[PDB]
Design a protein around this ligand. Structure first.
Ligand code: AGS
Ligand code: AGS
Ligand code: AGS
Ligand code: ADP
Ligand code: MG
Ligand code: MG
Ligand code: MG
Lengths: 172, 348, 319, 325, 329
């Protein structure tokens, strides 16, 4: 036993007592590659997404903060219920909501555009594809905006960009 | 501008919560001899909001006109690295963690270019310059050991407001020289008051039970609570007490992973949740947040004698994930250890 | 006249005397016997025999025309932006009479030190004058040679030398030099060789010059290795979970002034070839790598080596 | 004549018989000297064991005083040793003969483990091409800092540490030529904890005679440092004897009155731990915990928590040691 | 007449103003008289005056006109490599002592190297300084200052002679901050300043910087106990008692509530580890439980030093101390 109850006579010893107060003595003497490609492509998509953000809103949150909180619920903001009626027959509240939605699209620099399909029809989609960054394959589907609504949003974005150009012309 | 950008406070007095700390930081920066600040707390507490209020009190109304600067730095391996910084005429915010392992160079070269460069104007601009080194908890230790000598050789020229979430990842050599400013997260009543003030600023009417559910389902994160409140506003404008709040697809995926471990504990379900976790990882959510959400949804199902061991395992696997390089293997190890523990718990 | 060292004395002259990677050696011997060699870049660890193979191939292809059909450059030359334009290109345009199947040979040894602009300028000179001249380059790290230079040549990769290929040439040198030898000295000198022929030959020269007889203590005294018999005993004590005897070996090695990096490299090399259970070997290698990360990050002392020994003893009692 | 010099320079082994420990390497290099076949050498080992003394003794023996400047090219780390020096004075030294007397020359590169890698890869052709004209003595501290080609090009000599069984008469000669009274206990103190080499024992004696004038164990430990085994026995007696609060307050009293490091309290406690006959499982646990505390202290931790962890590692084992009986 | 950083104004200008360090004050005054100055080893606790005493000794020896030509103070605020101590210290040690004091004061015939904060040096960095110290000892002098003596290797501690630095009692340091705030025309009660010098744990410079930044925080008004806990990030003791009550309860729901509270209170996890350790060593827990809690605090501090998440490490530490506190319940 390395621990001695009796103290050593000739050899040096170091004492040891426990909490009870009892004395003792010692002796001193292909899924991974494709997933990595997908993650790299999505990181490049995130960098191109945050590169287009205006500097006034870029400092307010990190890319992690914008990705976790302000993308999917932002995607819920950007797709409200919109009736297929022209802008001349819209109400004042609908015009204000349209102006606010176009302003929030301009703040994040998101613009709809036309894309081609092999089936023979045209589709509308955002220039940064943020729908891959939010929706999951197992999630239940949601009704997207119609062709007329997305085309109206795109043309209102274009005329609002020209409105901002002429605003910068008249203030300067 | 969403509901997390159109409704942010301007000055320190305009905060809806932590008003006595706002008064303390107002008196701190009024004299002009303020030390290096280290702001910390949880995510969504109001840290960056209070840093912008501090910069709004320090300088004029010219701190909000931010610009983006792209700087190409040279590594010791002679490989050029682009870093994106936010700049102004009054301060400078750098996120060196985007440079990864080269962040020390951003400490050793970029910081000097803001510290050995004197201010061009001494009347409108004050005697010092503020450097917001954002997410310094994710910085390398060599960068922080190169940070102490830059912040103390040029005390009279540059100030550092280091923003982080964990000061424990910041070395105590930094924390000794700098003032620790703590930003607590708002309480449930504070989040309900913020949501009610936002809705009354938008002409809305928000039932108290729905505001309480929005506050409870955001884990005391005000940004996520405001964004899901706007999601509830868009989804159904007549606000009901039992309104389905749009839970995020990341959280729904973690819920389905938890219910998949509950329903069947087999290696093909392990491969399926590996696919779900890969889908989350390719969506670039950081794996610490994925581990936090997995544990938060996971312990709601486990028994009272099972919560602590799963929490300790989660902490160990998060530590090993931060120590290593690849996160999928450590997340798979966490899910495999949890399903082995559940199998042992349900089989006896 | 002075005696050359055995590294340069026993350099092979023919391709049949070159050992290691015998498929590439046979291909080069076929190209030397027949002719019409393509552009060749040889990459691998140093001491493999890239320069020797290039020299033997060039000698066997040329013969008497080595002073006119061969242009040899090394890292001691410039090989800058002017040498490629005004020395390589004029030799590519130089009319040299040669037999059929034989081309002019431009040896560019150690192409890692050559600049990127020189490699960009070399491309058109290699492509246009490939009917008359050929290019044979030797490099250690193949990433420094750019992609267009890599694509224009048949790139050969040489592996590390095994023990039998080293031992055959060592027995050849021993029989040519009449060196009295044993088996333990040979296995110790190929343990200290670690796949390097030149280091093995220099260690053999050191053993023959210092003592003249080949046993394990002689080579471990003149090559001053950390003596992997004691490291083997230390790993065996960590298998038996005896921290006292393993620490006595560690204190004996530490009293002699050995660095932590060298003793942990020797402990990794001994643990690689150890004889135990496979998963126990995996856990030991993982723990040794975990401690080697601590050593390579900067902190090293007797305390962390004692912790390595104690964790190796703990892994035995963790089933 | 008396000279105002340090005793590590005042008593220097000018000749090959004055060096003590490495008898076999000295005999081999004397055999190389006598028949003139001196090869390229690389000398390494623990610092302060007589490598620079050996190469300077060989240089002053093979080359005389009137011709030492034309034979020995000595460059150290204070001198710039870039590739311009490799292509300049070293290359022109190796490629030329001697003006005065015919013979081969010597190049010494002191502290050349911090050499630039381009210089190391450029010196290989200088060594091999001019091996008849000159030989190269590369002296370093670690073998890993040089390329394996330079390791193979020069014969390797590891100057080992001076053993306690042989380094006593050098101390006796120095203390006889200095006329200082010395005891056997002071001899044991100079032979045990003086880094295992005769590069500091002379400096220990010189600083002890500078500070006090008499060399005993009491006046050295109050002048050197490296706190006494009574103090370490007390700082471990608090951990293994008293309760956690009193032990923690007394050890932090010692560290906030004396000024002891926790890192070298760990080092000396670690050395003490193998002296103390702990049980094997208990010592395995203590070694794992102590190496964990050292690795924690190698990064940005709080030192007070690590001191409490060092106490707690023993507190765990207090009951175990007592109940083992 | 600008407000100076108030750790700089009350520094001792001479060696006579240094308190409680009687042996080294006598040795330094004998060196001022003209005696032989040995190589110094200043070792002791932080805040007791290792810096200002030798700086006032240099001010008395050389004055303002010869401070920049003879005195070299090295600290961790600049890069200290192997080549740095090979080149700069050895070249400055080989410089010639020239220039005399114009006010009639005698000048010592050597330079001074004040090596302050000498724990950041490695073994080879201190191994390089040895021949610099001894061969240039006629031209320069060395004063190795550390708060930790044995981190200097046995050679370089043997090349110099020690002088132990005595700590400060609580009553002597109370008065220092007392007068500082009195002169600054600022107000602080007795309980606040007593808890301040208790929290600082003997580091008088840390206490003075706490006083200055708390004066900045209050802006001229009363510095209360809550701002004293705020200025060091000190968690209130009832919140730590909140942890020790939620862990005595044995319920993981309240434990997660208080851990999410502390995370949502934004408290530093390292400071939480420090305060929990101080509370656990000032209490009456058994040795097995206290050892397990402190070892887990060290492991948690390692994981948080390597970058683990604050919430997960906090809930793991609080879960195992809940297990320890409810083990005997
Ligand atoms: N495979 C081999 N067979 C026989 N001798 C060899 C072999 N490899 C090397 N040698 C000997 O070692 C000497 C040096 O080999 P080298 O060809 O110079 O090494 P290397 O493979 O060219 O690597 P580097 O980059 O040139 S150092 C040769 O001159 C031979 O004496
Ligand atoms: N064998 C020895 N016998 C007697 N004195 C010795 C011996 N070896 C070293 N010394 C003493 O040590 C002093 C310095 O030795 P050096 O050879 O300069 O140290 P070193 O081996 O060069 O190590 P570094 O790397 O230069 S610190 C000499 O001046 C001698 O006084
Ligand atoms: N002995 C003393 N006499 C008078 N004032 C003192 C004394 N010690 C400390 N002080 C005062 O307290 C302050 C702290 O002293 P410092 O010299 O900064 O502490 P320190 O010695 O540097 O701590 P370390 O060990 O270097 S971290 C000084 O600036 C003085 O104002
Ligand atoms: N005092 C406050 N009043 C109103 N809204 C606030 C307040 N503090 C924070 N918020 C909101 O909460 C969110 C917190 O995000 P942020 O300020 O970036 O903190 P963090 O940096 O911790 O994420 C912001 O979007 C902000 O709009
Ligand atoms: Mg070659
Ligand atoms: Mg030397
Ligand atoms: Mg100090």
């Amino acid at each position: 036993n390395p621990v001695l109850r009796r103290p050593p006579i000739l050899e040096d010893y170091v004492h040891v007592t426990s909490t009870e107060g009892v004395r003792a003595y010692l002796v001193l003497r292909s899924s991974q590659q494709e997933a990595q490609n997908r993650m790299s492509q999505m990181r490049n998509l995130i960098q191109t997404l945050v590169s287009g953000i205006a500097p006034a809103t870029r400092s307010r949150a990190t890319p992690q903060a914008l990705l976790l909180d302000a993308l999917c619920l932002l995607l819920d903001i950007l797709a409200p219920k919109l009736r297929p009626v022209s802008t001349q027959l819209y109400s004042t509240r609908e015009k204000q909501q349209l102006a606010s939605l176009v302003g929030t699209m301009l703040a994040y620099s998101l613009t709809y555009r036309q894309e081609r399909t092999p089936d023979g029809q045209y589709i509308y989609r955002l220039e940064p594809n943020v729908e891959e960054l939010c929706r999951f394959p197992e999630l239940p589907a949601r009704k997207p905006l119609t062709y007329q609504t997305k085309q109206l949003i795109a043309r209102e974005i274009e005329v609002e960009k020209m409105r901002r150009a002429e605003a910068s012309a008249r203030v300067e | 501008s969403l509901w997390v950008d159109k409704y942010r406070p301007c000055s320190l007095g305009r905060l809806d919560y932590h008003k006595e700390q706002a008064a303390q930081l107002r008196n701190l920066v009024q004299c002009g001899d303020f030390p290096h600040l280290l702001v910390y707390g949880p995510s969504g507490a109001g840290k960056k909001t209070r840093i912008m209020c501090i910069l709004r009190e320090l300088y004029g109304v010219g701190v909000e006109k931010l610009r983006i600067e792209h700087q190409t730095i040279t590594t010791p391996s002679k490989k050029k690295i682009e870093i994106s910084t936010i700049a102004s005429n009054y301060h400078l915010e750098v996120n060196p963690s985007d440079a990864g392992n080269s962040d020390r160079v951003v400490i050793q070269e970029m910081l000097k270019t803001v510290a050995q460069s004197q201010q061009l104007e001494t009347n409108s601009q004050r005697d010092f310059k503020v450097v917001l080194l954002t997410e310094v908890d994710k910085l390398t230790k060599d960068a922080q050991h190169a940070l102490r000598r830059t912040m103390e050789k040029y005390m009279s020229t540059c100030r550092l407001i280091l923003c982080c979430n964990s000061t424990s990842k910041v070395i105590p050599p930094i924390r000794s020289r700098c003032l620790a400013v703590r930003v607590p997260a708002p309480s449930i009543e504070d989040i309900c008051h913020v949501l009610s003030t936002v809705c009354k600023k938008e002409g809305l009417n928000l039932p108290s039970q729905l505001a309480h559910r929005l506050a409870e389902k955001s884990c005391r994160n005000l940004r996520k609570a405001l964004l899901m409140c706007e999601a509830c506003r868009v989804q159904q404008y007549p606000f009901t007490a039992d309104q389905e709040i749009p839970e995020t697809d990341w959280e729904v995926y973690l819920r389905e992973t938890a219910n998949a471990i509950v329903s069947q504990q087999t290696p093909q379900r392990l491969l399926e949740v590996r696919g779900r976790l890969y889908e989350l990882l390719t969506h670039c959510i950081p794996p610490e947040i994925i581990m936090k959400g997995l544990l938060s949804e996971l312990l709601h199902n486990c028994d009272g004698q099972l919560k602590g061991e799963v929490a300790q395992m989660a902490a160990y696997y998060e530590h090993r994930l931060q120590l290593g390089s690849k996160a999928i293997y450590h997340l798979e190890a966490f899910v495999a250890k949890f399903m082995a523990l559940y199998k042992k718990f349900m089989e006896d | 006249h002075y005696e050359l060292p055995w590294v340069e004395k026993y350099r092979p002259v023919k391709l049949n005397e070159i050992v290691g990677n015998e498929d590439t050696v046979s291909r080069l011997e076929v190209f030397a016997r027949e002719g019409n060699v393509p552009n060749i870049i040889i990459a691998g660890p140093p001491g493999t025999g890239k320069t020797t193979s290039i020299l033997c191939l060039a000698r066997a292809l040329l013969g008497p025309a080595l002073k006119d059909a061969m242009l040899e450059l090394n890292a001691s030359n410039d090989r800058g932006i002017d040498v490629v334009r005004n020395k390589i290109k004029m030799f590519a345009q130089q009319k040299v009479t040669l037999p059929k199947g034989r081309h002019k040979i431009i040896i560019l040894d150690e192409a890692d030190s050559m600049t990127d602009g020189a490699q960009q300028a070399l491309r058109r000179t290699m492509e246009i004058y490939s009917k008359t001249t050929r290019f044979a380059l030797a490099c250690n790290a193949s990433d420094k040679i750019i992609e267009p230079i890599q694509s224009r040549c048949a790139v050969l990769r040489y592996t590390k030398l095994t023990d039998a290929q080293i031992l055959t040439r060592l027995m050849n040198v021993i029989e040519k030099e009449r060196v009295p030898y044993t088996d333990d000295g040979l296995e110790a000198i190929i343990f200290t060789a670690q796949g390097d022929m030149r280091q093995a030959l220099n260690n053999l020269q050191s053993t023959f010059s210092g003592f003249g007889f080949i046993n394990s203590e002689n080579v471990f005294k003149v090559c001053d290795e950390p003596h992997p018999l004691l490291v083997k005993e230390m790993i065996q004590h960590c298998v038996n979970a005896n921290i006292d005897e393993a620490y006595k070996i560690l204190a004996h090695l530490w009293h002699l002034g050995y660095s932590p990096e060298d003793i942990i490299g020797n402990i990794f090399r001994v643990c690689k070839t150890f004889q135990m259970a496979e998963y126990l070997k995996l856990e030991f290698i993982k723990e040794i790598g975990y401690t080697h990360m601590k050593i390579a990050e900067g902190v090293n002392s007797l305390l962390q080596m004692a912790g390595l020994l104690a964790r190796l003893c703990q892994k035995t009692m963790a089933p | 004549k008396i000279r105002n010099l340090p005793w590590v320079e005042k008593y220097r082994p000018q000749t090959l018989n004055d060096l003590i420990s490495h008898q076999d390497i000295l005999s081999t290099i004397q055999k190389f000297i006598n028949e003139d076949r001196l090869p390229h050498l690389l000398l390494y080992g623990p610092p302060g064991t007589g490598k620079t003394s050996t190469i300077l003794a060989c240089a002053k023996q093979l080359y005389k005083d009137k011709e030492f400047g034309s034979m020995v090219l000595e460059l150290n780390a204070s001198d710039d040793r870039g590739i311009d020096i490799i292509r300049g004075p070293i290359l022109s030294f190796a490629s030329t003969r001697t003006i005065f007397k015919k013979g081969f020359k010597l190049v010494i590169l002191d502290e050349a483990d911090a050499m630039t890698q381009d210089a190391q890869n450029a010196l290989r052709r200088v060594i091999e091409k001019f091996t008849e004209n000159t030989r190269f003595c590369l002296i370093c501290n670690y073998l890993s800092k040089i390329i394996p080609a330079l390791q193979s090009r020069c014969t390797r000599f590891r100057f080992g540490p001076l053993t306690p069984e042989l380094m006593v008469p050098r101390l006796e000669h120095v203390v006889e030529e200095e006329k200082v009274d010395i005891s056997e206990d002071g001899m044991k103190a100079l032979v045990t904890l003086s880094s295992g080499d005769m590069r500091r024992a002379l400096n220990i004696l010189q600083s002890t005679n500078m500070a006090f004038g008499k060399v005993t164990e009491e006046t050295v430990y109050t002048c050197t440092g490296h706190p006494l085994k009574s103090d370490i026995a007390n700082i471990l007696d608090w951990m293994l004897n008293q309760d956690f609060t009193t032990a923690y307050r007394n050890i932090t009293e010692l560290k906030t009155l004396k000024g002891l490091a926790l890192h070298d309290i760990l080092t000396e406690i670690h050395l003490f731990v193998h002296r103390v006959d702990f049980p094997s499982s208990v010592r395995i646990h203590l070694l794992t915990k102590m190496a964990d505390i050292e690795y924690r202290l190698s990064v940005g931790t709080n030192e007070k928590i690590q001191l409490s962890s060092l106490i707690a590692a023993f507190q765990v084992t207090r009951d175990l040691i007592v109940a083992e009986a | 007449a600008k407000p100076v950083p108030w750790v700089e104004k009350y520094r001792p200008k001479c060696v006579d103003e240094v308190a409680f360090q009687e042996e080294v004050v006598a040795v330094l005054k004998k060196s001022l008289e003209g005696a032989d100055l040995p190589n110094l080893l200043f070792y002791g606790p932080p805040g007791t005056g290792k810096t200002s005493t030798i700086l006032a000794a240099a001010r008395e020896l050389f004055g303002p006109e010869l401070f920049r030509l003879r005195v070299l103070e090295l600290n961790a605020s600049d890069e200290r490599g192997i080549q740095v101590v090979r080149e700069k210290v050895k070249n400055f040690a080989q410089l010639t002592v020239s220039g005399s004091r114009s006010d009639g004061k005698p000048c010592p015939p050597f330079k001074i190297v004040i090596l302050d904060e000498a724990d950041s040096m490695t073994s080879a960095a201190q191994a390089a300084l040895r021949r610099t110290m001894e061969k240039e000892s006629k031209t320069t002098r060395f004063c190795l200052i550390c708060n930790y003596v044995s981190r200097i290797i046995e050679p370089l501690t043997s090349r110099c002679s020690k002088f132990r630095f005595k700590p400060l009692s609580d009553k002597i340091q109370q008065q220092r901050l007392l007068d500082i705030a009195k002169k600054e025309n600022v107000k602080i009660s007795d309980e606040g300043i007593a808890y301040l010098v208790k929290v600082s744990e003997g580091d008088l410079r840390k206490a003075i910087t706490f006083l200055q930044s708390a004066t900045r925080l209050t802006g001229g008004k009363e510095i209360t106990e809550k701002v004293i806990t705020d200025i060091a990030g000190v968690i209130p003791a009832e919140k730590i008692d909140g942890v020790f009550a939620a862990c005595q309860s044995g319920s993981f729901d309240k434990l997660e509530a208080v851990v999410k509270d502390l995370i949502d209170e934004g408290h530093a996890a390292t400071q939480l580890v420090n305060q929990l350790h101080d509370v656990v060593v000032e209490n009456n827990l058994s040795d097995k439980q206290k050892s397990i809690i402190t070892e887990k605090l060290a492991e948690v501090d390692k994981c948080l030093a390597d970058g683990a998440d604050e919430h997960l490490q906090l809930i793991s530490l609080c879960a195992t101390v809940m297990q320890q506190l409810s083990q005997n319940c």
